[PDB]
Amino acid sequence: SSKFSNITIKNFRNFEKVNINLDNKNVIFGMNDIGKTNFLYALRFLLDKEIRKFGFNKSDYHKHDTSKKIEIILTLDLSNYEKDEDTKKLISVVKGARTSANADVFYIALESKYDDKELYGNIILKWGSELDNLIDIPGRGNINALDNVFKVIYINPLVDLDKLFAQNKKYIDEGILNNIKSLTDQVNQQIGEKGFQQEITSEYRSLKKSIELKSEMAIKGFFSDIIPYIKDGRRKMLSYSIYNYLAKKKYEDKIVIYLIEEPEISLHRSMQIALSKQLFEQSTYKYFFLSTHSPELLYEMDNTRLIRVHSTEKVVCSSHMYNVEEAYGSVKKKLNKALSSALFAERVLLIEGPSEKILFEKVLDEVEPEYELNGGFLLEVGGTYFNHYVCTLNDLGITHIIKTDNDLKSKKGKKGVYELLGLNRCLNLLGRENLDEITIDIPEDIKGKKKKERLNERKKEIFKQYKNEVGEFLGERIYLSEIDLENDLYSAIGESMKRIFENEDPVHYLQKSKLFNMVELVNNLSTKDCFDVFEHEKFACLKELVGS
Amino acid sequence: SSKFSNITIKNFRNFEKVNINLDNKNVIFGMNDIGKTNFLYALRFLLDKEIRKFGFNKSDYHKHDTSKKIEIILTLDLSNYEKDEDTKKLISVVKGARTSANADVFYIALESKYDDKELYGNIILKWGSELDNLIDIPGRGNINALDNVFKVIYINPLVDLDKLFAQNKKYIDEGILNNIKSLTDQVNQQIGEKGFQQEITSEYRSLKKSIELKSEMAIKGFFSDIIPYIKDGRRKMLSYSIYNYLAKKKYEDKIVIYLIEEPEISLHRSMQIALSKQLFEQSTYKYFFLSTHSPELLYEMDNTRLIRVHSTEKVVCSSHMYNVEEAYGSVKKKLNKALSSALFAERVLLIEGPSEKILFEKVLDEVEPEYELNGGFLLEVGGTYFNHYVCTLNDLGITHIIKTDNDLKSKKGKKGVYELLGLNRCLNLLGRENLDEITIDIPEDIKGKKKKERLNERKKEIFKQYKNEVGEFLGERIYLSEIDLENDLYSAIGESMKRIFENEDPVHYLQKSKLFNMVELVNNLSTKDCFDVFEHEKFACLKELVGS
Amino acid sequence: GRGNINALDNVFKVIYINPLVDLDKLFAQNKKYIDEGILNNIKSLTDQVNQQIGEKGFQQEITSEYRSLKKSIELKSEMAIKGFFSDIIPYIKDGRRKMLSYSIYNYLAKKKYEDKIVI
């Protein structure tokens, strides 16, 4: 359902052989800053006439090897031709280069072979329906048929608004203009109305065989300079405001593709969210490619493809089609802001709530305070299932770790029925179906602390029944507690928790106020306590997060 | 206890009259990008010889008025002279410009008066112990005594490592060097060992009345070019790695001041945290001024002064000495990451946990989804008191709003005693002392849901007793619920909550699993429900957050 | 000397004539230092430009786009804000304009630097 299928880059700079799936809206990010920039340049060379005329240098070839040929192919999908207007744009120019047998697909390729004597390898653009017999894109002079289809707008991080406005002023009443024109000449008559015009001529005439020297603008009219005025960081957003209005009117007849590199540069965090809303929520930017290091620039992300360039020197690329389902729509904004910062990390530990974050932040601080520097990240997920977070992180090649409590949820409208919520979420990551809800018989005289302890006994009983299902969880880096985190914490530092709280049952007291008591616990936690919790088998997720 | 007291900027560019307190480590941020840049330039003009020799242009004067004089004064504190080594650095150069009566203070001023005929206003640097009779800083030629005290290192956002390395190579064995030197000459003898050297001379000699042409490096030795090699974004951190080692050895005899502008540019989020740890935790950067738009660059902030430039055109500056107390040290990293993003907002709503964030994000989405674009922010605080967050936001001129539940906490080691935790935190913001803990008599047969309902009756009773104390909370934008959020939510949409949950007591069912049930609630919440919750008097904090 | 100037800078003013020079750029340096009832009519007429320029579809649509993006966008025209004197570049009635730059230097330096020795 997207015109842009995938792009292939062969032997171009650090790209040995890289295949990346695509969509209308694409966002690229990762550690390799060189790979992200070369990715945008590889798209410009294929589609931007100004950057393509310069040809390939020796450095652009992969590993500076001129024998290997540079090849950049863009695969397109024309299946939605019946209801896509921009698809008909491409068809009208391609004409007979398509075949009816493969009418759904169309290829746009860039081939380059290097000449030693000419010290210069030219760029030959081919297209066609079949990848085997691509034909040269027809052209006459400095323009070809491809330049009539696609117009590439590259938004530099740093831009002067007055300079770009001078480019758009020309194309963007008459009886009124005539009065302004005659009045413009009225300026020059009053300016001359005098001692300098006559003395510079007497000096010029003796020097060289009328020197009036009027004033600019009045010669060419008021339209020559019409720079804007509002009523550094603020004017950057007005340049985007010009781009939206300009490109639609100027390039309505062709497909416009935006290449936005690092737009968060010299931009406030609040404006980054404003730009993110305009990129995804608004239909103003139909097709763009975005390179960003800013998590706040993805707060409003939806219906986009996320491309992650790996930190390795091989320049491996992992792409994910990020789409928020309608069921998650009521918590979409909360979910995106938490996941946006996790895309840039290397290992993400899925925790439930803030009480786990308060504990883990203190424990990690004593054991390994540089865990975020090396790519670790604590992502808290509350109320929702793990599938949306795991699918996005898995496709992007990000190591995901899950630590959740074994919980039971009472079904509404019926008493005595409890859903196996803790197991179902871990089973959902493995693709298995939700387990049947169970009914446990608790007497009416058993309430409060006595009631909770009996429910814990069912959790331990349920945990033992699915002993093999837990075995599959550990292979998938899923860590399901027997009862909950507080009981696993008691197993690691029971002597410390009893001394810290002086209460004979520290687990019961910790769960009274989970946030406050966890803060009270971490304040009195010893350094050996943090190492004991870290080294304990029940907390293997902390060892997997640091990556030892 | 800090050498840098405050700085005064008068009639310099957009700074009409601005007074900013300072410390050794300073971070500046805000909407006004022009004010932050002019703030760093105002410091360079006072202390950087290279930027000071160019003098003041007409544009540098405030509102382009040359009548008003530009004045930049830096107030210093020399009280810690007995134990501060860098203080003795300044004393050794100032010599007799200090008086013993005001020995604790020293002024460094920049005065500029404009000449119409000379079209140029020079920079006159004065210093002295008394602000009334400042004396010209002694100098001879292009250097003065102040250039011997302070060395300003300005770190540009974009820097080439090889170029800065060429500046530091000179100042950073012999029998080994002698073998490398003779071997270097061995290159040239083997290079000549020939057809080009004789033919270009035959052409040159006929053209003009020996043309051997050897090879660079071999003439000046191997030390001329020694560029580094490791075994774009990665090399930026190595440039900082050079700066730490270079500046300490090169400028050990003088006070080095770093001016770092927008270092998050072209830097990964993980490296920003690495740089933040080096700025605050490490003692490598004793004195610096930091301009940043990145919240991740303040994850490790501590013992620094936060300067916030207001969004207004008057360029108002609010400064806060941010310091984390020892009591908050066990949750310092968790607290900083939440507060770092709140410094850049304009209105911050302090909520307790994520269940409040899940609800507020959905409600705000329907009512005002652009609330973060206009400066709103939801900051969740769990387990800790509000004083640390409110003091930082209040000093920076950021509107702070607090919404918390009226809670009771059981004291450890004793039953029947409950602390008025909900009221104490709101009283702590007003400066009042903690209230005396109360004891409520609950029978042993009353447990579970019946026990919670009796405790709610005490909360309503406690709420009515302190009816006037709640009145002072509303003036301070403190919103204390009578019982909790769930009961206030029932008051706003009771009909909707009963229909959504089908349970006769939706408040009791919502509190069973606060996270999951809140997600279940917001999914079925109507648009009119969000407007009813927003318009209700119990949720006036949402109206104060958007700023209507 | 005091600051960036010394007594020698008050005696001698050095004019360095580069082989390649743009006349319009050097003229912008000398325009400031080189009647009133006439200037007042030119000034009011300069404001008469801006009133007739706005007299309209772009000023309202860019604001609707800006206001939704960020919490009036009229955008007039340069020169009319600072007056006619901001840009007054010359016009005669590459090699020829080089001699006119010397023609400016002779007249400029004598009036501007009459009080000091010009080299």
Residue numbers in the entry:
A (entry chain A), B (entry chain A): 0 to 171, 181 to 201, 206 to 221, 225 to 246, 259 to 575
C (entry chain A): 138 to 171, 181 to 201, 206 to 221, 225 to 246, 259 to 284
What does the paper say about this structure?
To define the structural basis of Gabija anti-phage defence, we co-expressed Bacillus cereus VD045 GajA and GajB and determined a 3.0 Å X-ray crystal structure of the protein complex. The structure of the GajAB complex reveals an intricate 4:4 assembly with a tetrameric core of GajA subunits braced on either end by dimers of GajB. GajA is a class 2 OLD nuclease, with the Toprim domain containing a complete active site composed of DxD after β3T (D432 and D434), an invariant glutamate after β2T (E379) and an invariant glycine between α1T and β1T (G409). The structure of GajB reveals a superfamily 1A DNA helicase domain. Comparisons with UvrD and Rep show that GajB protomers in the GajAB complex exhibit a partial rotation of the 2B domain relative to 2A–1A–1B, consistent with a partially active conformation that is poised to interact with phage DNA. GajA tetramers form through two highly conserved oligomerization interfaces. First, the GajA N-terminal ATPase domain contains an insertion between β7ABC and β8ABC that consists of four α-helices (α1–α4D) that zip up against a partnering GajA protomer to form a hydrophobic interface along the α2D helix. The GajA ATPase domain contains a second oligomerization interface in a loop between β6ABC and α6ABC, in which hydrogen-bond contacts between D135 and R139 interlock two GajA dimers to form the tetrameric core assembly. Major GajA–GajB contacts also occur in the GajB helicase 1B domain, in which GajA R97 in a loop between α4ABC and β5ABC forms hydrogen-bond contacts with Q150 in GajB α7 along with hydrophobic packing interactions centred at GajB V147. Notably, the GajAB structure shows that the GajB helicase 1A subdomain, which includes the DEXQD-box active site, is positioned adjacent to the GajA ATPase domain, suggesting that GajB ATP hydrolysis and DNA-unwinding activity might regulate the activation of the GajA ATPase domain.
Gabija is one of the most prevalent anti-phage defence systems, occurring in more than 15% of all sequenced bacterial and archaeal genomes, but the molecular basis of how Gabija defends cells from viral infection remains poorly understood. Bacterial Gabija defence operons encode the proteins GajA and GajB, which together protect cells against diverse phages. Gabija protein A (GajA) is a DNA endonuclease that tetramerizes to form the core of the anti-phage defence complex. Two sets of Gabija protein B (GajB) dimers dock at opposite sides of the complex and create a 4:4 GajA–GajB assembly (hereafter, GajAB) that is essential for phage resistance in vivo.
